[PDB]
């Protein structure tokens with residue numbers, strides 16, 4: 001599938017607002033994922049002991065992790081689909097080290113959309129949410145293809 005330049009600009013205009021405070025956005029997204037789909041938290045050996053949103057918010061390691069996740073996603077989005085080099089290591093790690101199914105990438109996509117919709121109504125109206133959904137769908141389609149190449153059913 002392929003996004004138009006106008007769709008990419010809607011993605012990158014909301015991402016510019018994430019980048020005012022990537023750490024706070026990462027906390028909100030990870031907490032939303034873990035609350036909405038608690039089974040995902042069991043994939044994190046470092047974090048699966050956290051019992052409450054307050055503990056999650058207070059975890060410095062979780063905050064640093066969210067910064068890495070959103071910075072990797074932002075680098076992918078800034079490639080506007082030309083993200084083969086960035087996806088290779090991400091897909092190998094997520095298939096073979098972490099064992100993250102596509103369904104769980106769908107859950108984090110939903111958490112990203114939920115947090116952006118909540119924080120950024122000025123840059124996340126219906127057209128912008130549709131563009132971000134297309135971008136995340138493209139990311140998941142290309143990860144799924146790489147999973148299959150790597151031998152992981154996902």
Ligand code: HEM
Nearest residue numbers: 040041043044045046068069070072073098100104105108
């Ligand atoms: C937008 C989708 C995602 C992106 C861009 C992403 C990106 C990353 C990155 C960059 C790291 C490495 C951080 C480091 O250098 O230490 C990481 C680690 C990890 N990811 Fe993801 N990830 C995504 C989705 C998920 C999901 C949905 C799960 C689980 C449900 C997951 C599970 C993990 C695990 C278990 C680690 C290792 C964490 C640790 O070192 O303690 N990822 N991810």
Ligand SMILES: [C-]#N
Nearest residue numbers: 030065066069
């Ligand atoms: C990956 N979190």
